[PDB]
From Swiss-Prot, chain A:
Residues of the full protein shown: 126 to 433 of 437
GO MF entries: ATP binding; ATP hydrolysis activity; identical protein binding; protein homodimerization activity
Name of this protein: Vacuolar protein sorting-associated protein 4
Residues the record lists as binding ATP: 48-55
Protein role: Involved in the transport of biosynthetic membrane proteins from the prevacuolar/endosomal compartment to the vacuole. Required for multivesicular body (MVB) protein sorting. Catalyzes the ATP-dependent dissociation of class E VPS proteins from endosomal membranes, such as the disassembly of the ESCRT-III complex.
Organism for this UniProt entry: Saccharomyces cerevisiae (strain ATCC 204508 / S288c) (Baker's yeast)
Other facts: Present with 5350 molecules/cell in log phase SD medium.
Subcellular location: Endosome membrane
From Swiss-Prot, chain E:
Organism lineage: Eukaryota, Fungi, Dikarya, Ascomycota, Saccharomycotina
Location of this fragment in the whole protein: 116 to 433 of 437
Keyword Nucleotide-binding in record: yes
Gene (UniProt): VPS4
Topology in membrane: Peripheral membrane protein
Protein name stated in the entry: Vacuolar protein sorting-associated protein 4
Record organism: Saccharomyces cerevisiae (strain ATCC 204508 / S288c) (Baker's yeast)
Binding site for ATP: 58-65
Amino acid sequence: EKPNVKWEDVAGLEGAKEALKEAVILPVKFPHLFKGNRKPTSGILLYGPPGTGKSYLAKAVATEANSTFFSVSSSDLVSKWMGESEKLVKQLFAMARENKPSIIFIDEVDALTGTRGEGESEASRRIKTELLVQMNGVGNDSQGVLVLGATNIPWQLDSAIRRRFERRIYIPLPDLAARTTMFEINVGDTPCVLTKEDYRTLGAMTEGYSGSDIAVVVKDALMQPIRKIQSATHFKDVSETRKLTPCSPGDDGAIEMSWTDIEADELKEPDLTIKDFLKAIKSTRPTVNEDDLLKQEQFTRDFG
Amino acid sequence: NKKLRGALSSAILSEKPNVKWEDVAGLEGAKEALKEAVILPVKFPHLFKGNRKPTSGILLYGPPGTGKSYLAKAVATEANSTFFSVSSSDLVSKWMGESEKLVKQLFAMARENKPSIIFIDEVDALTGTRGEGESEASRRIKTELLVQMNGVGNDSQGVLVLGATNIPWQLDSAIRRRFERRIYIPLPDLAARTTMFEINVGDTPCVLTKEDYRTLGAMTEGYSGSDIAVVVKDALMQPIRKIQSATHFKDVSETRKLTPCSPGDDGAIEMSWTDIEADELKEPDLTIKDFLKAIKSTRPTVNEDDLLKQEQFTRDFGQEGN
Amino acid sequence: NKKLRGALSSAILSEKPNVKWEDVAGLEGAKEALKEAVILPVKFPHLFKGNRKPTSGILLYGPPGTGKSYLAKAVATEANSTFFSVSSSDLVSKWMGESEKLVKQLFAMARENKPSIIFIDEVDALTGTRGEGESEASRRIKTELLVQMNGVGNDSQGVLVLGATNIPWQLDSAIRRRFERRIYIPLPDLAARTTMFEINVGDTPCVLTKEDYRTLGAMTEGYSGSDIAVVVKDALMQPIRKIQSATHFKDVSETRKLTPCSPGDDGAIEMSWTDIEADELKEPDLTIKDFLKAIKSTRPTVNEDDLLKQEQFTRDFGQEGN
Amino acid sequence: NKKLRGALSSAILSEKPNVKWEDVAGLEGAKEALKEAVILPVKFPHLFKGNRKPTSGILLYGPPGTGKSYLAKAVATEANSTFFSVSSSDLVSKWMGESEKLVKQLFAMARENKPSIIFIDEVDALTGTRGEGESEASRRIKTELLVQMNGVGNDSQGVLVLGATNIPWQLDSAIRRRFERRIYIPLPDLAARTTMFEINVGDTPCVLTKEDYRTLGAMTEGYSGSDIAVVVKDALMQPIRKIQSATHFKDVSETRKLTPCSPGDDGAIEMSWTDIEADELKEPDLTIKDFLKAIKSTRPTVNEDDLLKQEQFTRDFGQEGN
Amino acid sequence: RGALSSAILSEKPNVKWEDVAGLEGAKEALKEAVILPVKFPHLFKGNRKPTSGILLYGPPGTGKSYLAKAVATEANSTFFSVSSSDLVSKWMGESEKLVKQLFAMARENKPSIIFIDEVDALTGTRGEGESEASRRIKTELLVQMNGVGNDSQGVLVLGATNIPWQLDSAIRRRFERRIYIPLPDLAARTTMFEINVGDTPCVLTKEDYRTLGAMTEGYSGSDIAVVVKDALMQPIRKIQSATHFKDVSETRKLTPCSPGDDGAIEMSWTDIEADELKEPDLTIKDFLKAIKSTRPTVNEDDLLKQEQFTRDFG
Amino acid sequence: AILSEKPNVKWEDVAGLEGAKEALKEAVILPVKFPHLFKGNRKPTSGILLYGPPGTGKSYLAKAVATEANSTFFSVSSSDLVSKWMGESEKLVKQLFAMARENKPSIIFIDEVDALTGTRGEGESEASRRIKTELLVQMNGVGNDSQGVLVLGATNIPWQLDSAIRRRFERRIYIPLPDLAARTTMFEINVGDTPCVLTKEDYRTLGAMTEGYSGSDIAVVVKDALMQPIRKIQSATHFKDVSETRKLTPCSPGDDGAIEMSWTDIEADELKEPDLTIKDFLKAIKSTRPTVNEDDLLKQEQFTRDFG
Ligand SMILES: Nc1ncnc2c1ncn2[C@@H]1O[C@H](COP(=O)(O)OP(=O)(O)O)[C@@H](O)[C@H]1O
Ligand SMILES: Nc1ncnc2c1ncn2[C@@H]1O[C@H](COP(=O)(O)OP(=O)(O)O)[C@@H](O)[C@H]1O
Ligand SMILES: Nc1ncnc2c1ncn2[C@@H]1O[C@H](COP(=O)(O)OP(=O)(O)O)[C@@H](O)[C@H]1O
Ligand SMILES: Nc1ncnc2c1ncn2[C@@H]1O[C@H](COP(=O)(O)OP(=O)(O)O)[C@@H](O)[C@H]1O
Ligand SMILES: Nc1ncnc2c1ncn2[C@@H]1O[C@H](COP(=O)(O)OP(=O)(O)O)[C@@H](O)[C@H]1O
Ligand code: BEF
Ligand code: BEF
Ligand code: BEF
Ligand SMILES: [Mg+2]
Ligand SMILES: [Mg+2]
Ligand SMILES: [Mg+2]
Ligand SMILES: [Mg+2]
């Protein structure tokens, strides 16, 4: 399923980008370099803290694959009816065997696969076990499928399934050039007075934010001027025939009115300033804690 | 009847995964027991008469990734008998005691096709010590497996029941009884690791000698066979990364042939793989820094208290797979 | 009606597994009770008149592998009755209260063909104390089994209901009441173990004496009858293995006959078993080192807190199987 | 219509199990209530006019094996009323509300054949407090039983609904309401146990006195009536064990009569029971070591926390059966 | 037709409004929903419409079905006592026409009151139920109980239940007056003893019934009906248990008396002639005997969930 | 299962709520009035949650928005979706969004978004994952078709609303319990034309005397009060003639023409039902407690503070 999403669209971490461009494109663009002992990779576990653009990179592989893409997830495989949560898995791999090449993206694999020391009999042993046997097994033939998977708790994963995912890549909190790129992307084609040093300023300002947070500070900063439109007392003419904008109570030509009072078009909507983005970044707060990072770095140093 | 055979028609595998006994490295005890329980009754059936009966159950256990399912593939190639690779997806159903008729129907199918082998992979997910489990799935699937394996009116002649597991201590004691040769598949030793490198490089052109493979096998203590399969995978994927990572190729030698070389060399043109014509590429060579590169990057899987409980079970109930 | 009898027609077993009362070792008490509840009413029916009625339920329990199902096969050979052999696979159905007209027409089959025996193998999987179980399976199959065994209008004359279990403490107290002689089948003792070696070697040519079997029986304390059946299996598969480790055979003595011998001996030709002609092989007999070899390799099944709960139940509700 | 009466024609029992009110031991109060609810309306129907109506529901509960179903057989002999004995096998049909159409037809038959008795044995398997049960079986069979017992247009004149149970606390409170005399059948006391030994030995020749039965009744505290029926069963087998273990018999005294005696005695011939002619055997009379032998071997069936929940229910909702 | 017209009863169980003890709010609502539209039909014109649904709930045994019998006697209606046995069927598309037929014959027989007793057995939240029985019945019933303006004669839908919290919220909506029938207090209990002894000869006074009504707190009306049943049995215990009777006073009449008394012959009831028995009087020790033996029925946490539902919806 | 209508409810028909109203005007009406304001990456709200105690007619307000946005009102009850329809609920949530797309400008109203969206940790498979998984996919429908549709959710218990669903409702607006003027209007509307002798001041009194009541509450009290004269006529002993030939009404023991009798004694029609009074409602106010707990103010205002 290919809507836009591209390798051009993503910001930072070219190790992930090159591992994947390798593991999907390098067989598909060339299916004749992989003969003999040289086989492509058949499982990749991405992880990291939330917000860091995992599933977006997955759908970049969906568009940028020329491959089928099944974005099932752990919400859709839980059941409660005695061995229904397994036939879903098996028929998923049946449509992936019948349709080579394929990609299976199991989002939040930590909700299926929970270290089996405290879990219940059926769901633990039977969903984990059918995932194991189905990934390599005996009569199963994992040719041409790639099993992705993302997680935030990579240390709560069963060691047999840590074994099956043969390239555990770590997606970290991003740097400076990526943040500047994300502001430049998310403002889109909206008229703004900002320069390169303005986006550079904001990217310097936001250390610690993931890509979600910058998408919502651009959302809020794009909704500042409309907010000063419609909750406005007092506008004022400036300058092609009449044009009024919101201004404080008592100013040079400050009439008292509401946006409703003002004629079609002849509104002078407030511009997009860097104080709008600084306003939004002051108000919007991220998720993370700096001990979660210690256990992530633990797992990366032990297995990743 | 035929609804159930319509379900279990997709278990008689029909493709013979070409793994031979030579490919499976180490473990001569487990191959020995499996040969004298699978190969030898068919090849010399006159011997097994009187009190001398063949074995009818073998449990393989061990840490994750050491050879269990793979050795089952070796049996599936070399056996010449009907092989059912059943699993938990194919035995549980929703309708109140229609799971049991799939178990009973599986062995009642297997005695139509005698000699047969039934390979229940990860038997610890069916058979969970029955002190905390639920009524139906627990007592009725475990109980029908028990009664069906030896029972009264049941006749386990000519069927063999394999089975692999990673948690052999969470197994019910009646089913520990039914599996009459619990063999233990351990982490490989030095000669096995050297054998696995020599196998996994295949017929790929390499400058390595016997002392090189001997060196790597000395280097990798603690790795299972999966890990050595992926360090050979990564070390084989180094040269392609030396074609993509090439600001510069060079002609050598049937009409034009260029390979990656360092910046500034004898005939070093500056280009990318994309610039170079179909076929007329001459890929790199394998030297021990490729394997050292891969072994630095790839990190193991297992953990050294899991081995204590495995050795516990082997010392209390188990064979030794050598 | 007849749909259900068409289902349960395949439970009245008819092949008569040829185990006779000799072939069980130990357990004089359990054979004694089973004879005076099965054999004796048929052979002398004039006795059982007045207040003297035969027994109508016997529960055998014990650790895994000690003789329960085997003793049921002995009854199935020696009884001269219509031995049914039913289980939980054959009573539970899919369509809403079919899983108890099966129970009812099972016992009505045994009443039409009296004197009958009903052998419910592993009864703790049908009958689970009904405080946590589900409505249909639990209350309705357990309840129809209760009412059908003694009830009001039901007449359990001339039917006998056996039953074996490994978890006798998880049994409902009404069904503990219905089984009126709970006999306990324990792990073996010295004379029984010696008897089991003498039985399981069969008619195989061996150099062993009575003091040799006596020696092995002294050696194996802690083993159940399964374990001794598999050490006899392995020890009978030792000389075939020495045929396999025999670079060198030798003629001895009806036209040519060769056996494995050490390198360099009186008539020691160098060959493999493959080289040697059909029949004209001379199989080596059995050393006591073969059995000591097998007993070193094979390891028992039971543990020693399972025995505490077995002895608990025997001291609170049970008999002693001797 | 007639399909359904063809199903329920096999419930009108027609054989009158010959248990009389003296074959019940103990239980003054329960016999008293059952007589004045069953016997007395038929024998003197002129009395029950005006405000004085007969009882229309009686629940018997207790520990397992104490007299409930047996007292129901006594009613079935002495009542002179049609005695329907229905159960959960005969009400749960396959077919969308037959399990309500069957119930309604049941009481319609028991109104066209009044005076009638309906004995629902083990009512706790139909009626399970409806907080966890399934929609159909739960709400629709329980609900049709409720509405059918008293309801609006229903007229429970002249029908009586008995019912026995072992788990009286797992009963729905609307159905606890419908059963308007919950009587409790307890474990027997001293005089009852002595009475049960005197009954169960029957007319068998024994040397026992009143102080012997008194001794045994003093010995057996904790036993229900089932257990004493089986210690009398086992103790009545003890002369056969003598008369088989008898190397040596001897004539005593209508033409020849021989009994087992010790080796070397007055007229001690050496033989086996097999050697001795039809009838002309003399079997040692029941002498008190036979009963002491049986009482040593046979062990109680009911534990002592089940009694705490029985006494709980009796103290919260119940009568006392004395 | 001829399969649901076994919902009409015709025997008229003779319970009148002066036999239910207490419950005056419930009689008030039932009178102004049943009696008053028929007796003064000119009043209900314009915005003033009669009530079209009444749910009675409570603990088990407190008066719900009995009060429905009182309506069935006093209403002068046509009365359908339908239930889940009479609506569900094997054939699909029969548990549509059966409900539909029911309300159409209710409009054949206006005025109609329909008593769907124990509605929680038809209407079970439809998340686990089977296809045929649960869904098409409950949807068709919701539709046909959405006849607000058209049902100005005819259907008044009663309904009783013991588990009012297991009822679907759309059907909690349709029943527009959920009335709660509780365990009875002092004057009601005294009234029930005075009713249930009937015209039986007793030596009791008003302070005796007052005493018993003070004694029985916690009992529902069923329990007092059975202590009066048992206490009325107590004379026949004092006739069966007899060694000695005696003549008193229309030609010969003998009653049980103690061993050795004025005219105390020794005999058994069996010895005595038809009729000429003098049935002993009813004391207060008979009732104290019965109240000692009989033990209450409702448990005091069932009342907590009843009070829960009353405080949330009732 | 899905209602549709082009409703005709003006802002003025909705008692009070002026603050919500003004929020909705700029959240919904401004985009619709001046669409040219929303070119490029500036996009109108497309999820709004309405939250507050029951009995505020969140539904009615929702129809006013539709009327004022000149849009079709499509609506669904989540309780019905979860219980009544179950099996076909996925289909229903689909069709609902599909109708709304086909009918821009339009508004989807989901009532009781709390009875649908319950955090998905312990819910059953079909209703839980399938209904709560379809709504979310559909509300991502702003993008495939961001323009022309708006989802308004309604909840009484916002604290029990699935955080995933919660997050799809950018804008959140608290619908508070009413006010003196509004309660006064509600009394008038609820009696409408009914014959009674209430003054303008009585209505205000009734208003003042029902602080903390909802429209619903007031509706039940009024329904109760109007029946009082019928209640009096139906049950009384002493009656009395007043005034087309004989007409008697209940009066106290001992009054001007007070005969002693029962309603049963009195002839068809000629029975005088009591006139309506302001005082009588006061009775009805005592016998109907308000529905809504007082800690809701804060719980709703916590939401106005946090997600307003
Ligand atoms: N590192 C990033 N680079 C580019 N876009 C990002 C990044 N992180 C988040 N985003 C944007 O935020 C949106 C949500 O990211 P998502 O991948 O769903 O988060 P998560 O990885 O936590 O599941 C995506 O559509 C993505 O485009
Ligand atoms: N002893 C071995 N010899 C050859 N290959 C092995 C060995 N052990 C593991 N492998 C490799 O491991 C994979 C098989 O997985 P397996 O060892 O069966 O896992 P498990 O034993 O936990 O089921 C194959 O890639 C195989 O190449
Ligand atoms: N008492 C015994 N005498 C002889 N063989 C025995 C005895 N008990 C066990 N065995 C051996 O045990 C084997 C397996 O035991 P089995 O019949 O399964 O016992 P059970 O069903 O109780 O577990 C039998 O086939 C027999 O070979
Ligand atoms: N009270 C008793 N008096 C006489 N025999 C009794 C008594 N209780 C039990 N028995 C004997 O024990 C058996 C068990 O009685 P039964 O009716 O089955 O008990 P229940 O149904 O309660 O479990 C009866 O058949 C009878 O043989
Ligand atoms: N108010 C009452 N007046 C008279 N008898 C009553 C009353 N309530 C209960 N009873 C007695 O209890 C019996 C049971 O009433 P019933 O209709 O079964 O109650 P419900 O249906 O609530 O459980 C009544 O028939 C009568 O015997
Ligand atoms: F004792 Be066996 F396992 F039946
Ligand atoms: F009926 Be019994 F008490 F098991
Ligand atoms: F209140 Be009753 F038990 F119907
Ligand atoms: Mg494997
Ligand atoms: Mg067995
Ligand atoms: Mg019984
Ligand atoms: Mg009732």
